[PDB]
Amino acid sequence: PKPAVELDRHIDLDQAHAVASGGARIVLAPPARDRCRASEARLGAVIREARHVYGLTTGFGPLANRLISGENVRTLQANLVHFLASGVGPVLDWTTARAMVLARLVSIAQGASGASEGTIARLIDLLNSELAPAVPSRGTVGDLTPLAHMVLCLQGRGDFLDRDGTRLDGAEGLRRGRLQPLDLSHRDALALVNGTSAMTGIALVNAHACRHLGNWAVALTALLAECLRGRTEAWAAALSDLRPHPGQKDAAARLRARVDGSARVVRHVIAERRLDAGDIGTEPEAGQDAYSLRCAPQVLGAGFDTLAWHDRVLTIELNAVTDNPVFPPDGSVPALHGGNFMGQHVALTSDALATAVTVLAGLAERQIARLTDERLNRGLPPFLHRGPAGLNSGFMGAQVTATALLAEMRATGPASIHSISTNAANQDVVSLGTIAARLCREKIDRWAEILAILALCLAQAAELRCGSGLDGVSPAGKKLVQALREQFPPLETDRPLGQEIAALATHLLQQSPV
Amino acid sequence: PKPAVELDRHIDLDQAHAVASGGARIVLAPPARDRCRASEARLGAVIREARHVYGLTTGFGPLANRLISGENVRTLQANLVHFLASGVGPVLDWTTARAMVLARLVSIAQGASGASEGTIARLIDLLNSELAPAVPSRGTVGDLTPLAHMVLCLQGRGDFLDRDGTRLDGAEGLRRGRLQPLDLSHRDALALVNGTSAMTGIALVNAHACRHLGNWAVALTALLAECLRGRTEAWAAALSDLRPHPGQKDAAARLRARVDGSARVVRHVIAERRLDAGDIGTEPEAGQDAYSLRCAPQVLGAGFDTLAWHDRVLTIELNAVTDNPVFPPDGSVPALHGGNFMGQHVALTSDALATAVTVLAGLAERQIARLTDERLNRGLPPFLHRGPAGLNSGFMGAQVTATALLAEMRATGPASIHSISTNAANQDVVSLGTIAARLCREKIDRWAEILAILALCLAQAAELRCGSGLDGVSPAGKKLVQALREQFPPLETDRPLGQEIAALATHLLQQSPV
Amino acid sequence: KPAVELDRHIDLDQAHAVASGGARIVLAPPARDRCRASEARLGAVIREARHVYGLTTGFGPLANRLISGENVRTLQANLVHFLASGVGPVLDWTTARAMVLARLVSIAQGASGASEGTIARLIDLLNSELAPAVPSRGTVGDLTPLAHMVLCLQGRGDFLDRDGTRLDGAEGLRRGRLQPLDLSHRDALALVNGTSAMTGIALVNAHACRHLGNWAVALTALLAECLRGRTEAWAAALSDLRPHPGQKDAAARLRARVDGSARVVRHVIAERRLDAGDIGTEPEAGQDAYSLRCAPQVLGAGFDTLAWHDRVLTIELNAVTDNPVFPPDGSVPALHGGNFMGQHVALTSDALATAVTVLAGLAERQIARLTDERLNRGLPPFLHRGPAGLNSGFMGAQVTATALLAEMRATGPASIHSISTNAANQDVVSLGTIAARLCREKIDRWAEILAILALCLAQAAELRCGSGLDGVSPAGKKLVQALREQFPPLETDRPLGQEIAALATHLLQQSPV
Numbered sequence A, B: 001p002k003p004a005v006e007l008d009r010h011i012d013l014d015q016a017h018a019v020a021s022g023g024a025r026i027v028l029a030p031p032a033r034d035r036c037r038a039s040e041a042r043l044g045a046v047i048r049e050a051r052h053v054y055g056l057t058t059g060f061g062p063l064a065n066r067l068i069s070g071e072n073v074r075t076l077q078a079n080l081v082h083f084l085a086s087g088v089g090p091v092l093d094w095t096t097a098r099a100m101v102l103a104r105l106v107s108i109a110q111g112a113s114g115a116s117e118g119t120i121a122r123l124i125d126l127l128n129s130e131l132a133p134a135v136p137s138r139g140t141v142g143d144l145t146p147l148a149h150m151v152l153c154l155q156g157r158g159d160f161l162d163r164d165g166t167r168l169d170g171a172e173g174l175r176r177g178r179l180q181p182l183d184l185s186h187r188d189a190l191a192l193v194n195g196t197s198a199m200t201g202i203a204l205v206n207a208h209a210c211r212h213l214g215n216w217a218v219a220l221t222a223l224l225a226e227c228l229r230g231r232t233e234a235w236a237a238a239l240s241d242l243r244p245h246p247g248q249k250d251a252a253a254r255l256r257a258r259v260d261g262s263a264r265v266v267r268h269v270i271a272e273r274r275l276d277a278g279d280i281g282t283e284p285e286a287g288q289d290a291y292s293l294r295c296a297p298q299v300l301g302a303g304f305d306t307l308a309w310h311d312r313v314l315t316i317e318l319n320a321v322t323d324n325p326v327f328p329p330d331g332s333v334p335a336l337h338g339g340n341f342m343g344q345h346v347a348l349t350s351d352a353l354a355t356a357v358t359v360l361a362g363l364a365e366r367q368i369a370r371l372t373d374e375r376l377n378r379g380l381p382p383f384l385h386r387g388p389a390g391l392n393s394g395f396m397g398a399q400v401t402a403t404a405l406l407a408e409m410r411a412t413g414p415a416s417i418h419s420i421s422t423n424a425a426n427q428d429v430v431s432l433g434t435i436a437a438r439l440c441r442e443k444i445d446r447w448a449e450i451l452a453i454l455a456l457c458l459a460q461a462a463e464l465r466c467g468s469g470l471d472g473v474s475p476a477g478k479k480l481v482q483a484l485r486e487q488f489p490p491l492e493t494d495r496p497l498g499q500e501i502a503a504l505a506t507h508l509l510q511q512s513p514v
Numbered sequence C: 001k002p003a004v005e006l007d008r009h010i011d012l013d014q015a016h017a018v019a020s021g022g023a024r025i026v027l028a029p030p031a032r033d034r035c036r037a038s039e040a041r042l043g044a045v046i047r048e049a050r051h052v053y054g055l056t057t058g059f060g061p062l063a064n065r066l067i068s069g070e071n072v073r074t075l076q077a078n079l080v081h082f083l084a085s086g087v088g089p090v091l092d093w094t095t096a097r098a099m100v101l102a103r104l105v106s107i108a109q110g111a112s113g114a115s116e117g118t119i120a121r122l123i124d125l126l127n128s129e130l131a132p133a134v135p136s137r138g139t140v141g142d143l144t145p146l147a148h149m150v151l152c153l154q155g156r157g158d159f160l161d162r163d164g165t166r167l168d169g170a171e172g173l174r175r176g177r178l179q180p181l182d183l184s185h186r187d188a189l190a191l192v193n194g195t196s197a198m199t200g201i202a203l204v205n206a207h208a209c210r211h212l213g214n215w216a217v218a219l220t221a222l223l224a225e226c227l228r229g230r231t232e233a234w235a236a237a238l239s240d241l242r243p244h245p246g247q248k249d250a251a252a253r254l255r256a257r258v259d260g261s262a263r264v265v266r267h268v269i270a271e272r273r274l275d276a277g278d279i280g281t282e283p284e285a286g287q288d289a290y291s292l293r294c295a296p297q298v299l300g301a302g303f304d305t306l307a308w309h310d311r312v313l314t315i316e317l318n319a320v321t322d323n324p325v326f327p328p329d330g331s332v333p334a335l336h337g338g339n340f341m342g343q344h345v346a347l348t349s350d351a352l353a354t355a356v357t358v359l360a361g362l363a364e365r366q367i368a369r370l371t372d373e374r375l376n377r378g379l380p381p382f383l384h385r386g387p388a389g390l391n392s393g394f395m396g397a398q399v400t401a402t403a404l405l406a407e408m409r410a411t412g413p414a415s416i417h418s419i420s421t422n423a424a425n426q427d428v429v430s431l432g433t434i435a436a437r438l439c440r441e442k443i444d445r446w447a448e449i450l451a452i453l454a455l456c457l458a459q460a461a462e463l464r465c466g467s468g469l470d471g472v473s474p475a476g477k478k479l480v481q482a483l484r485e486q487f488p489p490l491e492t493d494r495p496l497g498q499e500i501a502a503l504a505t506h507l508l509q510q511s512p513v
Ligand SMILES: O=C(O)/C=C/c1ccc(O)cc1
Pocket: A060, A061, A062, A084, A144, A423, A426, A427, B396, B397, B398, B400, C287
């Protein structure tokens, strides 16, 4: 059948991605259902009592000094969704748009948003269907705009996307997915248009993708060592202990496991060798590898620690209530007004992860540059070509493409530093977290393409070095190459590699080598 | 009666775009045809005499040290197109891809490429058709990769694009366009896979778009003055003469022309007024406007001067021969080997223009921020809303979206500074001109979206200030607003503006307010 | 003077105390014992002629050239020589000393083989009032600056006194009562190794950020007292709903700063029940602009970034980033790897730099609002005193704060610029030192922006509450009174440049307490 995630208070990143990707169905646990019913009742009381609350009795933003009569709240909230729907640009992909819906749902599930049962049910239905709302990616300063567009979609006044990205009009979407048109009669519109749902959704997808790419980065570094007689002593646990960064210790341990059983790497500790007068001279190779191999634990490790921080922060954000206003469950006050919608946390972690991804992509790019260079690849053919040299150039084009992809990644920096006072100076500081998460996503995609090129190069190098039978190659190394060869043929003669690179990249983002 | 551009030696940017956009057919002038026939013969002689020439008797890149025998040249060049086809990412748009084809053709028309009549005919046929080759946008470090993909398409081994961007397979493209499959039997493949065609094509399209956006920037700045009682003395010709930057002089003159006949702007020179004792005190407003109006000539002027430099360099590049190797028409030597393919010129001008575009986009964004701010717009409704305030928020959403678009533009910097040694260190320095051109393009697209928002705001602001009859508004101002109103209704009540912003943006990129 | 006893672990505060000269340093007996054990191990490795980088080999790609024992002294002397190609302004006194300390902490773990004399030279330097004069540029991340350090310690390079005044090598040894470094034990690699430079810069960055962060909170609080800020946005209940540690902390500290204030608005707006007659346009909105309302969220994100930066730095500072390294357990004679790759400090420094730029932006917008007559709710334009027009008050300083911020924004992360070098042997580099230095510059700019905000607030508090600061919180009063001891009110326009600079210097070293 299909796994089910029961949402109560906390959901981890893997469960979140399982629901967003449609791998798991979602159910609201009874305790959460009750907390929400209780919050729904508080919203009703707040409205009946005519309490001064943003979005219920006031205009929006700087126009909040304009109070609104109870009789016009339906109109007020309907116009809110209208004026905020100014988004432009390509729509968020299927999984990401759904991840945004999930983020809003989790926040509501805490029971401080006043969302009605019907409203919550509409979100749950969307997540359990095979559809996703079609929402423009640009417009928010960090996430009312994309969420307003989502509202329109859920009402059948906006497009939906199937798993392939093909768009369906509103009516067809509600029909196909058996979704009921969203009804905001309870005046709970602010429960849907609020918080950091978009950036959080984009970021959770980024987190999942990086985990997989990180695994490939490790696996490919290990296979590279098997193709270039890499020295395993640089990956010793003893070194990790002397500089105990968790990410590094982990990267080194994972690299050691990848080459376990290999007869292609050099496992001797050079310091065990005692030299005598006859040894003093110039040896063919230095006693240690170039950094792209020797410093892999340190480079990958730093990236892993950045991702770990990103995920710790994101886990808190995903399970938080980023709504404004909010209705305290304890009933201490009718409502609280603040700025929990300021997505500075996801903005800063996304920018940091973006830098880490660019750094790791650089490592992979240099690994390709070393492996394909006849002067540095220790005996392998130039650009790993087969057939007569000259007539054939092998991966010579693909190698430059990897560099071009990396150079492009470097052209874009952090989004967070570009805050600009807007909304008549009322939003004098903005997070730009949604843009930050999206820019990181792009780099992640480029990284997957660079890794794909490295994987194809390594599959070829492994066969050139060890023969088609991959003699001496580790069990893990053999399985990886064999799996790649199931869909990607050896490069016996020059052929277009663009489509294959794109196809493999898509795979790397969703599955790890195991 | 579809216009025709006769190509001999030189072609300007407007003619180039006319052909690339399909607004004009292209024909090769008699002298050009002859220069090419003569060059074709020179290539035959070079092959006949077995001259040591790159791509004719050698491998590619660092592999050029491997000499190739005449009987294997067909295969050599066939593999060249193959190994180079490692491009990925969204394909270049219809117009840009065709601009690339045109750029290669103009280079060849100088008669130093050795292209055969058939090869030239294939390019001409493509340009005179309604199709464009479907080529991936990423892969080059600056443009063999995208050009190799072009070759495949032209042979019927790659997709094509119709004016709407809908993809056709190789066969369908040749059929629907009534094209002959490209035949490289004359060993003239390097006449197609060479130079800076892609970045040049992308840049010439950027050039055309910037001219139109620049006209809108001037037009909207002028209309803004009519909506805020702007002072025209800051735009006086006398100021331009005191600081003679061509772009500034032009910007000021164009601004004055836009408000000619306006009764909504203040034309009185403040220094003409003589003050008495009873004047000393605090006046309602200062004698000078904020910079977004007062400094428009200087800000727009600097941008225009940047575009002028960009266009001068681009014009030389488009009409030059960026091939390697080349066959001297004067017959001095069989061939010359160098690096005219190094796209550093387009790389630097594209980066400079990208900065200028971001700066000008900032001006527009600040003009929107001021116009929608009730504390700064001198009496206009907050966010130019209609209907009850608070219940309606007008362009409050669109204003923030404009800020978000600008913030995203700023996150991406120059592409040129990221050169990385590649191709086994043979290409130890690369231009990244194609990337630079593409990054500039994206910024141009964001600028158009920001200008569109400003345009919609100004149409509303004009009517709110001067009534639906636009009383006192200049003839140019009236025409622009009336033209907009033909497709974009007034905002009498809040409504989603995303789709309208996108639609208007597409228009601003291809047409100026006239 | 307090003393920090170094055994195995030292925290960031103890580290800065030693680097800043506020505390002496002593190597604990257990550390001295472990180091002596390591010194003995290096001796054996040499006697046994084990194949070890720097002891029997050339450097970098030249390590394939094996070296005979009789030439090792020359080998390591030339190492220090060819690495001394550094250029640029020297690291400041505190930072250069922090670098020396970082190398020492690594050595104290007992896996570097450093001799007692070598260790003594590092301790002597730290206990003196001097710092080695080392150029800040040259390393891709930290052999170059450390090589310069070695030359200084041998009396072949300048020293800096606390004031930054330079002394030649001979004068430095004499004045500081330092003995010339002797590397006869062939333990040069114990000094020219690891990530000491970037770590030292980063720990100084960490200390400065803690203080500026305290000011950012104190000034946000005082801003609330000058603009009738609403405290409900800083409620702990909101923190609990979105439990980021940094945010909860920021909010709590903000509430504490305004405790006792009668100038802030404490009413919870939702308590108010509206009547038909109230419907219309009120003078002010029920919530403050983001520079006040979202302060816990913005400051909080910055504080969580700093916390991550500090966690990673603490591990780095207390680790052994040496290569090669000599295992205390004796499992193998020596290990060869890349613990000198400064990617951790590179990534955290870049991340912190971004956070600093974000927080400086907040401070800058707070100034922009406070000085705007249209937004400061009744305060004079640009907080001037005397006749308006004739006086412009802080109109210049406000633009200056904007200029400082704009400059900060022009520089991005350093880590993404790795370039294959050293004949492709170092095909990937961290650039961690550059990263930490770029972060330091942003920190210096942030201090100047905060200094401007502080001077504006002192004036604004007096204009709003009178010289007696009526209704101002005890903490707010104490902060202004402290500032006023050295910075007079602005009763008439005057040059503020030097005062801004002087105050910024103070903000980096002390918090409002
Ligand atoms: O809470 C606020 O003060 C700001 C609200 C806001 C709502 C819609 C926008 O488009 C911009 C700001």
